[PDB]
Design a binder for this molecule. Structure first.
Ligand SMILES: CC(C)CCn1nc(-c2cncs2)c(O)c(C2=Nc3ccc(OCC(N)=O)cc3S(=O)(=O)N2)c1=O
Length: 557
């Protein structure tokens, strides 16, 4: 069937959009080639509409059905609980798009009677109606990039009332079933250090390791009604409260499978017959689907001893090599299978025999050295998009602080430490806003974070060695330096000098701000210290931090 049908109504913005990088007094201190940075807007939504619209055909064979039978057997061991309206409400972001029924996100979180009364009747309607398609809003994402211009990603999402109900019925399933079904292959269960650990141990576990990533063209569009149905049969394998089963079935038939698309102005835009990107189960269902197709494709291509790592639509496979040219032929057979399954490639997969050349979740493993000269593997990425985004956040306050999220995910990296930490801690000092909490996303879920808790969070996540890394690899140092040339970012030498200043200004304030100077910026001094564990770090509730993915999922912690 066609992934989408369109009436020709435009996808409309909910407010004023900017596409050129706003500039302020701080802008040039970070990035000077302002014209290489842009933000996607709703002005380009029509090209994405063309791009995500095509016919899917699926040919499902025994390898496909065998794997599914395996996954369901695992799924059968999962017990999930219904969440209460109250529990579901506190998972709602403070800033989540308001209902069309006279209440917003803060209404939800306060368990206000208007919100709770509406939520109860959506629930009841779900239990009493398994047919009537549920309405969705279609919007264009404003995301910041660097000239390669990409058209805007789209977001399709049901009303605030449906979204609370979704959590009641499926929050516990989507958090817990994926690890049980996919085991160590489920990606969102790992912190960045645990991901590096798994990749390395896996690579080492092969007699002759080969690895490749597989990038599907517009994954959401390739998801068919069969797929969304298949993943419901997985869910329904769980031990469930009868109200949960009924609601999951209802949400599957009415919403997950398909539904009408309405713009921010109230006009019908068309019909969806593929994955909606703004539903709770988006991440879990894409992960499951990508894992089923790929697993099944590993058998068609007779790839030997595969260890897959899947995060939504993002897939890396590490297997036993069969010889370079035979690996090349293998992957072509992998791709013909994936294609039959309705998941053809963007870029054709390539075999890699150097772990550090594999990109997965936009990231690669690299090596540096700790205080003792020990080799230590860490996760990193091309800093271009991080830097483009930080330029923007340098002038405009945004719903998500990518700089903050990147500091946490890439704390051990050359670029996060030397540039991101230096830049934004300088900004925060001048506004006296270190204790002001800021929203970032980690694995698609929203978190409110104090810049001041950074060294404690970084210690827990990556360990004290993130504050001591040095002697980075030549390829990593070159990729960073070269990105800086491209973007017009001061060279790493300038950052070091600025950081001695930021460090000094931080220690001057004493307390936690000083701990920030001490731990985050110890790399910037000759008279560097011994970094002992932070006392208050065990008091942090880092439970629930790397357990599941919830992108599109409207989840707050
Ligand atoms: C694997 C990590 C250790 C490093 C890279 N990284 N980084 C982040 C960051 C979050 N804030 C700053 S960076 C982050 O939130 C994610 C991340 N990974 C996803 C991957 C694939 C995804 O697929 C979406 C779908 N197809 O439905 C979704 C995500 S995510 O959960 O939004 N967040 C991520 O993978």
């Amino acid at each position: 069937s066609m992934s989408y049908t369109w009436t020709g109504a435009l996808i409309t913005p909910c407010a004023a959009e900017e596409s050129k990088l706003p500039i302020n007094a701080l802008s040039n201190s970070l990035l000077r080639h302002h014209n290489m940075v842009y933000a996607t807007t709703s002005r380009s939504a029509g090209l994405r509409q063309k791009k995500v619209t095509f016919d899917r055909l699926q040919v499902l064979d025994d390898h496909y059905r065998d794997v599914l039978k395996e996954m369901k057997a695992k799924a059968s061991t999962v017990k999930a609980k219904l969440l209460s309206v109250e529990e579901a409400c506190k998972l709602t972001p403070p800033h989540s798009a308001k209902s069309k029924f006279g209440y917003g996100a803060k209404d939800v979180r306060n368990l206000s009677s208007k919100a709770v009364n509406h939520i109860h009747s959506v629930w009841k309607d779900l239990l009493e109606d398994t047919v009537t398609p549920i309405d969705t809003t279609i919007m264009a994402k404003n995301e910041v990039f660097c000239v390669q211009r990409k058209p805007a990603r789209l977001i399709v999402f049901p009303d605030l009332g449906v979204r609370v109900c979704e959590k009641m019925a499926l929050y516990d399933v989507v958090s817990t079933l994926p690890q049980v079904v996919m085991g160590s292959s489920y990606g969102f269960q790992y912190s960045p250090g645990q991901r590096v650990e798994f990749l390395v141990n896996t690579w080492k576990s092969k007699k002759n390791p080969m690895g490749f990533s597989y990038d599907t063209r517009c994954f959401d569009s390739t998801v068919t009604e069969n797929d969304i149905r298949v993943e419901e049969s997985i869910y329904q394998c769980c031990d469930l409260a009868p109200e949960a089963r009924q609601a999951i079935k209802s949400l599957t038939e009415r919403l997950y499978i398909g539904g009408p698309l309405t713009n921010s102005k109230g006009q019908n835009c068309g019909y969806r017959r593929c994955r909606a990107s703004g539903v709770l189960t988006t991440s879990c269902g894409n992960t499951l689907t990508c894992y089923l197709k790929a697993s099944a494709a590993c058998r068609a291509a007779k790839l030997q001893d595969c260890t897959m790592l899947v995060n939504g639509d993002d897939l890396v496979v590490i297997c036993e090599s069969a010889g370079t040219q035979e690996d090349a032929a293998s992957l072509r057979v992998f791709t013909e299978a994936m294609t039959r399954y309705s998941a053809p490639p963007g870029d054709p997969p390539q075999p890699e025999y150097d772990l550090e050349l594999i990109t997965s979740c936009s990231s690669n493993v690299s090596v540096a050295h700790d205080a003792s000269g020990k080799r230590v593997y860490y996760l990193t990425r091309d800093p271009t998009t991080p830097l483009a985004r930080a330029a923007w956040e340098t002038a405009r306050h945004t719903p998500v602080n990518s700089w903050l999220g990147n500091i946490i995910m890439y704390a051990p990296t050359l670029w996060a430490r030397m540039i991101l930490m230096t830049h934004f801690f300088s900004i925060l000092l001048a506004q006296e806003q270190l204790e002001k909490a800021l929203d970032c996303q980690i694995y698609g879920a929203c978190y409110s974070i104090e810049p001041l808790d950074l060294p404690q969070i970084i210690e827990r996540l990556h360990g004290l060695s993130a504050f001591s890394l040095h002697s980075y690899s030549p390829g990593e140092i070159n990729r960073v330096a070269s990105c800086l040339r491209k973007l017009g970012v001061p060279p790493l030498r300038v950052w070091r000098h600025r950081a001695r200043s930021v460090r000094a200004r931080l220690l001057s304030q004493g307390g936690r701000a000083a701990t920030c100077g001490k731990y985050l910026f110890n790399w910037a001094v000759k008279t560097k210290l011994k970094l002992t564990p932070i006392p208050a770090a065990s008091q942090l509730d880092l439970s629930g931090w790397f357990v599941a993915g919830y992108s599109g999922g409207d989840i707050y912690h």
